[PDB]
Structure formats: C-alpha cells, structure tokens
Amino acid sequence: KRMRVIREKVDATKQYDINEAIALLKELATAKFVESVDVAVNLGIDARKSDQNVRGATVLPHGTGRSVRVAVFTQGANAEAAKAAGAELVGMEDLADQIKKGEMNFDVVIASPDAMRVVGQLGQVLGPRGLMPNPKVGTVTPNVAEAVKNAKAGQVRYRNDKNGIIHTTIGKVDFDADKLKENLEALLVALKKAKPTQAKGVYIKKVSISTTMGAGVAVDQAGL
Amino acid sequence: SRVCQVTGKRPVTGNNRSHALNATKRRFLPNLHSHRFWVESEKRFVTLRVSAKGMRVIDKKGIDTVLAELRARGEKY
Amino acid sequence: GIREKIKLVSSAGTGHFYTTTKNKRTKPEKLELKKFDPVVRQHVIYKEAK
Amino acid sequence: MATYYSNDFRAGLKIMLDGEPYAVEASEFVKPGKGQAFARVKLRRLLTGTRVEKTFKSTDSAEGADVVDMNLTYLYNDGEFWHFMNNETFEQLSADAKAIGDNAKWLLDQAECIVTLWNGQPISVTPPNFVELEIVDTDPGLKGDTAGTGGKPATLSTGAVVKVPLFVQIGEVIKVDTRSGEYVSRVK
RNA sequence: AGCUUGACUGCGAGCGUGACGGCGCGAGCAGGUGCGAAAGCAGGUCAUAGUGAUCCGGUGGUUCUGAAUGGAAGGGCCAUC
RNA sequence: UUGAGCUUUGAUGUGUAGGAUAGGUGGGAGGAGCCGACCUUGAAAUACCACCCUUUAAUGUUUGAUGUUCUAACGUUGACCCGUAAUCCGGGUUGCGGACAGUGUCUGGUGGGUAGUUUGACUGGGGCGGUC
C-alpha cells in the first residue's frame, strides 16, 4: 500500500521538539502535487459558555503574498481608494446580488463603519453558516481602508471558533524558509495568549500538532 | 479524667482563630478510646483507656512491655 | 471611565517604558510613537502593550 | 463601582445583591415620626424573572450594575446559540437558550428586538410588538354548519400554534402580536 | 491643509500661594529629536474644574544590600498598578 | 454488581436535498481499481487525511458508589451468675447489634441560643429634608 509507511515514523510517545520533526516534513509525506502545511492548536473552551470565544485578526510576521480575493463595502472616495490595496470587487449593494447567488469566490469580508448598513441588513444569514467574517472586536472594519489589505490580503489568517477545544490554522508553502515557520508557530503562541477571555480553565494549550496536508504527524509543544 | 494511660495526654488549651484573627479559648481533646487488650503473659483481658497514638506504641512494643511502665508510676489497671 | 490606560514598551533592549491613556473602543490599533529613551539615548519607536 | 442608598434609586435603576440583579419598578416614601424612614420598593426580577418585594430602610446602599438596555437586530441561528447585531457601533453578540425561554418562536428574522446586557452577554430577549409569520400545517377549512365564531387551529412555521379564521389555509403570510399571541391581521 | 510626535530624559536660578502635607509659574543649561530656507518655537491642549495622603500588595528593571561564605528568597532605588 | 477518567486499537454518526448508506471546523487535487473536487444541492458539499466531538468494547485502569455475608474491635440503659444482705459499678458465659454507631482532630453549611462592639457631622433644638 501507500498508507503504511506513513504510520511507521509517527511516535505518539515521543513528543517532538521544534527543530526535530518540522524540518523533516518533506520526507514524511509522499504527496503527488504541490501542497502546503496546516497547524492545529487547541484552546480550552466549553461548548455551552459564550464568554470564552477567542476571535481576532492575526497579522502574520514570508511565504504566500496576495492570494485571497477579499471584498470591500465602502462609500465615497474609499470605494476608489481601497482598490489600490489589491481588492477586485469594491462597491455597494450591487455586491449584495452576489451574496444572494451564493458565490464562493470570496472568503473574507472587510467593510468600514460607512457601508455597515449593507451587510447588517442584506447579508444577514448568508454572511456569518457562511462564516465570511464584521467586527470592534477584531480589526475587520476600521476606517483605514487604504492600508488594510497591504498586509491583510497578503499574510493574515483569521481565527475562527469551534464548539470544542480546537483552533486549526494554516501553514505556508512547503519550500519556504522552515526556520521562519517554526517562529511563526512560536508567534502564534503570543497571539493566542494575548487574551488570557480571562475565564480559561486548567491549561492554556494542551495538544498542538502541525500536519502538512494529510500525511505527516508532527507533535509540537506548548511551552517551547 | 481524659488522660491516656500510655502517653499521658491531658487536654491542652488553645485559640479558635477565625478569619479576622478573633481569639476564643477552646480545648483540644485527645482521641481517646476504651479498648480491651490481650496479654500473652497474663492470659486475660486488660482494658486500658489509651489514645490513638497509644495503640501505635503497642503497635511497636509488646503489650507486656507497656504495662511494666504502668507499675512504676502508681497506676491502677 | 471609558478611556483606559496603556503601557508603551520600548522596542530596544532596555526595560524603560512610558505610560499613557488610549480609548480602545474608538481606534483599536496600536500606537507606534517615536520618543526619547533615557537609557540607550536613542530615539527608539515605542510599541503598545498592557 | 457605584453606591445608591434608598433615597437615590426610585425608578429604572438596577441594583445588585448576591445576585441576581433586580430592577425597581415603583416605590413610595414614608418618613414617619419616631423611628427611621423606609421605602416600599417594589422590585422586579430580571433573570427568571417574576417579582421580589423588599422594604429598605434608610440603611443601606446597593451596587448599581449593570443598567444597559439597547436596540439590537436578530440575524442568525445555529444549533443552540443565537446572535444579534448593533446599528450604532456594529458589534457582535452571543445569546443562549437561557435568555430566550418562552420567546424563541416569535422572532424569526431581522426583527427590531431588545435585550438586557449584563456581564456577558445577555440576560433575556424581548421580542417586538409585530412579526410576520406563515402557516404551513393547517387544514383546508370548510365552512361547516357553522352558526357562529370559529375558527380553526393552525400550526405555524416556527413551531408555534395560533388560532386563525377561515380564509387562510396554506402558505398565507400573516402578522401577529407577541405579547399575548393572537391573530390580528394578514399582510397583503 | 502639508509634514510630524517636544504629550522627551536629567536639571532648574527664582518667586507666587498655603499652618503644613502640597499646589502653580519658570528663563536657561546638558543630552536627544520635530518643523521652518532662515530668524525661532515645542518638556501637552486659550486659561482656571476632570481628582485623594499613607500603609499593604502585584508586575518590569537595576548586584544596591543580601543574617558564616558563594547564590537566591525577601527588602532598597527607579518606572508603575 | 458496578459507575465515572486515561496514553490503546478501530468500528460508529442512516433526515430536507444531491442516484444515497453527509460527525463540527480548517485545509482541499489522492489511492484486474476508479471515486472526487468541479456540479444539480442546502443553514453547511464530501474527496486525500488531519485535530477531535460522540456510540462501542478489549485491556494495566485510578479507584470511588453500595450490598449482601461472617466475627474478633466497639455498643449492649437484654437476661442470667458472682464480688454482694447492692435496680451503682466491675468480671463471666450468652443473646442482639456490628465494622454501622459513637467520640477526637481538620473542614464547609446553619447559627441573636449567646458574647464583644459600631450605628457621622454641620443644624437659626433632634429629628426629618438638604449639604460635605
């Protein structure tokens, strides 16, 4: 088979370190085409408590550039100034017809506090099991719409909630600088511990494992 | 009174300190228990008013050894 | 009441810090002001923290 | 941290004690000769919330927090938990089944409902005065004998039940009230 | 409106006002910036209200001390809650 | 008899609707076989596998929860015998209880039954109202 040698070099008793198993992820996977990395990091959150939700925009400190097509909901001069930041479809309620069709070309929605009457009155159900974000909790809607997507369209990966403990994020292209990604995983620690919701349980992070796509299993540590 | 036969534990007095350091004169009573012991040398029942740690002395020493010290102090058993 | 306080941590090697007040619920981004440092005697850009 | 003695809170001022936090509806003031003054403060519960009655004297104070009540906008349902939306600051919010009890049927979509905000996030949800809803499970009502008033039961799309007259049978959107839960008119 | 962080660190002759604790103004010097071609100005906002002494306790820094010695704990100084 | 947790191996999720025999989310072009994204779909569209939610046992579990039985601790303010001309007590068989109760230490709850005290000042009397 091709699913047996994968289960050979996975030792759950030996929790791997930073420099040990992440650099050898190119040999643990026998993938055909060009793939990438994933990152799974847990945070203790009960399912029936609403004061434990951990969300926010994470500015990644490097791999992929402008890759995600993100929309703009602005009025006035910001409808022609946010186009310089890399967005394709910038406008108004003409983009609400694309919401009614259910277009999955967009993944992230960014607006500004003057077109917040558009998403809050038309994109009600389809925007958020759509899960498109528009928060003052996160930095989704500032009034700095010129300088939003100069780095957020490039390297920002959005933190979503789950019913359980899990917060899975995405790693970058396999042939990047692997010394920087191990610090990118180390600087996702300071972002997830930046909010200590102050009602956390016993641990902060129990299990943190970064898999590539479907083959590698790399058990990391929460301390280092 | 409340005195152990083996070790001689008369109840001491102390304070019942609350959270606001309020003193109240309580009295620490020992963990006494009227137990009936068996002696191989005498081959009969011996009932002494020992404490909880007094049986721990009998756990180490022999029961014939402890009553030898009772005789040299004017104790009735 | 509304306007809480922040701590401007120096991005240099020193442990010196300025402190000031910033209303978080109006402009939620960090401050990147550029003031004097009495330890390094440089003009280091300061970063926002708690 | 606030303080409110019995000569201060009179109407619509929340108090906090052990808890749950209560609300003053109406009160009187008696200042009798020989003795200390008091106030028959007719409090109102907020969480369960039926009633509580206390006769506060001139002593003592009570913590007043939180008070905040504001207009929200319902837009989302997923499993158990619900959400709302602002129009003055556009901030998200999370709701629970504890805050929705005996009210979850009437509010359907984009309603101008109000909640009570206290320390994360709601306490209860109050539905608006009029919502538009549709019947899907209703018999094709014959005239009958019928010699009077009546009037057939209708199972509603949200899981509720209302009494509708004869001329609405299948797929007729109607607006009702949420205070008592009776039929008033049909939208056209 | 352009450009920016002088809302900067160590001082400060002097006086004003208070029983005192304190408060207020401060030229100018030293280091280091900002703007203006340049003279110059800036250690907050036109001014006067937006605030409470100490004790104790918490965070960061600094061998300053550190109960025989070498360390650390706990104290000291400074920034500060 | 059993209940809950773990590093363990996998099985296990049957609607509306898409041919149906869909676990939540982030990825999303892998395994003489031939699916799949693409799409018809809905509140969410799968593949490839991840971190886990849950039904299911095999295990070393960590051990608690009780429930019978047995007697030798302990209770015996049941009888009988003796010290003893003694309804106290003590010894003796025995009967019924039985590792329950009871007591001691630690600890949470209840606690005007009880104890120590506090309950401001200016004020055209104190009070009341008002101010600091």
Sketch out chain C's domains with CATH numbers.
Answer: 1-50 (2.20.28.120)
Q: Can you tell me the distance from the alpha carbon of D136 to that of D159, in angstroms, rounded to the nearest whole number?
A: 10
Q: Can you tell me the distance from the alpha carbon of D82 to that of D73, in angstroms, rounded to the nearest whole number?
A: 11
The shortest C-alpha distance from A210 to chain D (Å) reads 29
Domain extent, residue B32, equals 1-77
Q: Can you tell me the distance from the alpha carbon of A41 to that of A184, in angstroms, rounded to the nearest whole number?
A: 13
Helix (H) or strand (E) holding D52, with range, is strand D52-57
Chain D residue with the nearest C-alpha to that of A121: D110
Q: In units of Å, what resolution does this entry have? A: 3.7
The type of residue at A94 is D
Taking alpha carbons only, the member of C34, C29, C36, C40 closest to residue C6 is C29
The type of residue at D178 is T
CA distances from D53 to A216, D19, D65 (A): 65, 15, 19
Cβ-based burial of A204 (10 A; exposed 0-12, middle 13-18, buried ≥19):
middle
Q: Does C25 touch chain A (CB under 8 A)?
A: yes
Residue A153: CB atoms within 10 A of its CB come to 19
Helix (H) or strand (E) holding A96, with range, is helix A96-101
Q: Can you tell me the distance from the alpha carbon of C7 to that of C29, in angstroms, rounded to the nearest whole number?
A: 14
Taking alpha carbons only, the member of D61, D54, D69 closest to residue D1 is D61
Half-sphere exposure of C12 (CA within 13 A, CB side): 17
- CATH number for the domain harbouring residue B19: 2.30.170.40
Domain count, chain B: 1
Taking alpha carbons only, the member of C33, C25, C26 closest to residue C7 is C33
Q: How far is CA D15 from the centre of its chain?
A: 19
Q: Does C34 touch chain A (CB under 8 A)?
A: no
Partner residue facing A120 (CB), from D80, D90, D109: D90
Q: Which nucleotide is nearest to C46 (CA to C1')?
A: E5
Residue of A55, A112, A134, A136 to mutate for C, most C C-beta atoms under 10 A: A136
Residue C41 beta carbon within 7 A of nucleic strand E: yes
Please indicate whether, in this complex, the C-beta atoms of A124 and D110 are within 8 angstroms of each other: yes
Chains D and B touching, counted as 3 or more CB pairs less than 8 Å apart: no
Question: Where do runs of H (alpha helix) occur along chain C?
Answer: none
Tokens, residue D60: 């003592």
> Reading across the β-sheet that carries D52-57, which strands appear in turn?
D14-15, D22-27, D38-44, D52-57
Q: Can you tell me the distance from the alpha carbon of A176 to that of A101, in angstroms, rounded to the nearest whole number?
A: 37
Is-contact B27 B13, C-beta < 8 A?
A: yes
Contact list in A for residue D76 (CB cut-off 8 A) is 124-125, 128
Residue C32 beta carbon within 7 A of nucleic strand E: no
List Cβ neighbours of B73 (8 Å cut-off, separation of 6 or more). none
Tokens, residue A64: 């992929």
Partner residue facing A125 (CB), from D75, D81, D95: D75
Chain D contact partners (≥3 CB pairs within 8 A):
A
Chain A interface with C: residues with Cβ < 8 Å: 136, 139, 142, 144
Tokens, residue D68: 């905040």
Please indicate whether, in this complex, the C-beta atoms of A139 and C28 are within 8 angstroms of each other: yes
Chain C contact partners (≥3 CB pairs within 8 A):
A
Residue D161: CB atoms within 10 A of its CB come to 14
SS3 A82: helix
Taking alpha carbons only, the member of D133, D84, D92 closest to residue D110 is D84
Contact list in A for residue C29 (CB cut-off 8 A) is 139, 142, 144
SS3 D161: strand
Q: How far is the CA of C25 from the C1' of F117 (A)?
A: 49
Chain A residue with the nearest C-alpha to that of C25: A136
Q: Can you tell me the distance from the alpha carbon of D13 to that of D25, in angstroms, rounded to the nearest whole number?
A: 9
Q: How far is the CA of A31 from the C1' of F30 (A)?
A: 8
Residue D61 DSSP one-character state: -
The residue written with tokens 């905000």 in the block is D117
Q: Can you tell me the distance from the alpha carbon of D36 to that of D126, in angstroms, rounded to the nearest whole number?
A: 39
> Reading across the β-sheet that carries D161-164, which strands appear in turn?
D161-164, D152-156, D130-137, D173-177, D183-185
Cis peptide leading into D151, omega within 30 of 0? Answer: yes
Chain C residue with the nearest C-alpha to that of A143: C27
Contact list in C for residue A61 (CB cut-off 8 A) is none
Q: Does C29 touch chain A (CB under 8 A)?
A: yes
Give, in degrees to the nearest 5, the angle at Cα B18 between B13 and B20.
130
Chain A residue with the nearest C-alpha to that of C29: A139
Chain A contact partners (≥3 CB pairs within 8 A):
C, D
Write b or e for each residue in A161-182: b if 16 or more Cβ atoms lie within 10 A of its Cβ, otherwise e. eeeebebebebbebebebeebb
Q: Can you tell me the distance from the alpha carbon of D76 to that of D44, in angstroms, rounded to the nearest whole number?
A: 30
Is-contact A29 A216, C-beta < 8 A?
A: yes
Chain C residue with the nearest C-alpha to that of A138: C28
Taking alpha carbons only, the member of A111, A148, A109 closest to residue A130 is A109
Cβ-based burial of D7 (10 A; exposed 0-12, middle 13-18, buried ≥19):
exposed
CA distances from A61 to A42, A174, A180, A184, D112 (A): 21, 17, 9, 7, 42
CA distances from D6 to A104, D9, D46, D60, D63 (A): 59, 6, 20, 7, 12
Approach to solving: cryo-EM
Name beta bridge partners: B27: B13
Is-contact D6 D57, C-beta < 8 A?
A: yes
Rg (alpha carbons) of chain D, rounded to whole number:
22
Helices and strands: H and E segment counts in chain D: 0, 15
Name beta bridge partners: D27: D41
- Chain E: positions less than 7 Å from a protein CB are 4-10, 31-33, 60-62, 79-81
The shortest C-alpha distance from A180 to chain D (Å) reads 35
Cβ-based burial of D21 (10 A; exposed 0-12, middle 13-18, buried ≥19):
buried
Please indicate whether, in this complex, the C-beta atoms of D121 and A48 are within 8 angstroms of each other: no
Phi, psi of A37 (to 5 degrees): -115, 150
**Strands annotated E in chain C:** 4-10, 17-22, 46-49
Please indicate whether, in this complex, the C-beta atoms of D92 and A121 are within 8 angstroms of each other: no
Sign of CA dihedral A172, A176, A182, A187: negative
Tokens, residue A9: 């070099």
List Cβ neighbours of B4 (8 Å cut-off, separation of 6 or more). B30, B32, B49, B50, B51, B54
